[PDB]
Amino acid sequence: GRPRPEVAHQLFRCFQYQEDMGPRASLGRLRELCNHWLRPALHTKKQILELLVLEQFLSVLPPHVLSRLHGAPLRDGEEVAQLEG
Amino acid sequence: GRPRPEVAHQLFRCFQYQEDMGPRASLGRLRELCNHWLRPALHTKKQILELLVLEQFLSVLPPHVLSRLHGAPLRDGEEVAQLEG
């Protein structure tokens, strides 16, 4: 989409609800952001799940372990794992 | 899979890292749980994304709004939205 996937990802997770726009508008906005992040037109189900798996995995890493991934691609668990044995 | 999808979902989100098993074991466990939750064998990409959209949406609802969804199916944003206009 328009926002880069990394930016879409954060907009998606940091989304704040507002009654003034309503459930349907909020779901619509979340749905667009989720598409901009996970890009189903580009990725197989396998790859989409791998991106979710990585999000959860990185969220539980100690800061000093995470820092070892600084700059590295984050698309495949196999690659992340080998990046740390 | 074996754990019900709702249970897998929580095991996935509540996963704690442990160095003693390592990155590869952790990613493997997360990958299984993510599959048990999102069931790509049963769901299209569209449906998998909708489940992620719903997870994010419900996470930002006020408790009293969420309670209005108590007992209701949570598979389609269209249905959740109409459940609240």
Side-chain angles (χ1 to χ4, degrees):
Chain A
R2 298 154 296 94
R4 297 197 290 264
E6 291 76 16
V7 172
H9 177 202
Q10 298 302 323
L11 286 171
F12 186 67
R13 292 303 184 208
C14 294
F15 185 81
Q16 302 298 336
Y17 189 54
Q18 51 191 35
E19 319 73 27
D20 60 350
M21 289 311 187
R24 185 175 299 275
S26 289
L27 282 160
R29 178 50 171 173
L30 287 168
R31 187 174 302 106
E32 308 170 12
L33 288 176
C34 194
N35 278 281
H36 293 326
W37 168 32
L38 294 174
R39 298 300 321 263
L42 303 183
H43 299 144
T44 55
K45 286 180 202 186
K46 179 181 168 78
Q47 169 78 99
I48 291 161
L49 266 60
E50 197 70 359
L51 296 175
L52 303 168
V53 166
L54 290 171
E55 182 194 29
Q56 180 65 37
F57 179 71
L58 301 163
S59 84
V60 294
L61 266 31
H64 67 283
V65 172
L66 201 62
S67 56
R68 296 167 61 190
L69 296 171
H70 182 272
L74 307 169
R75 309 202 49 79
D76 194 324
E78 168 57 36
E79 301 303 338
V80 173
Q82 76 177 40
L83 264 171
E84 296 160 328
Chain B
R2 298 154 296 94
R4 297 197 290 264
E6 291 76 16
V7 172
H9 177 202
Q10 298 302 323
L11 286 171
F12 186 67
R13 292 303 184 208
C14 294
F15 185 81
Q16 302 298 336
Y17 189 54
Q18 51 191 35
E19 319 73 27
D20 60 350
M21 289 311 187
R24 185 175 299 275
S26 289
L27 282 160
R29 178 50 171 173
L30 287 168
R31 187 174 302 106
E32 308 170 12
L33 288 176
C34 194
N35 278 281
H36 293 326
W37 168 32
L38 294 174
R39 298 300 321 263
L42 303 183
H43 299 144
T44 55
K45 286 180 202 186
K46 179 181 168 78
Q47 169 78 99
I48 291 161
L49 266 60
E50 197 70 359
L51 296 175
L52 303 168
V53 166
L54 290 171
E55 182 194 29
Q56 180 65 37
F57 179 71
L58 301 163
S59 84
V60 294
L61 266 31
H64 67 283
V65 172
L66 201 62
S67 56
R68 296 167 61 190
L69 296 171
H70 182 272
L74 307 169
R75 309 202 49 79
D76 194 324
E78 168 57 36
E79 301 303 338
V80 173
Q82 76 177 40
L83 264 171
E84 296 160 328

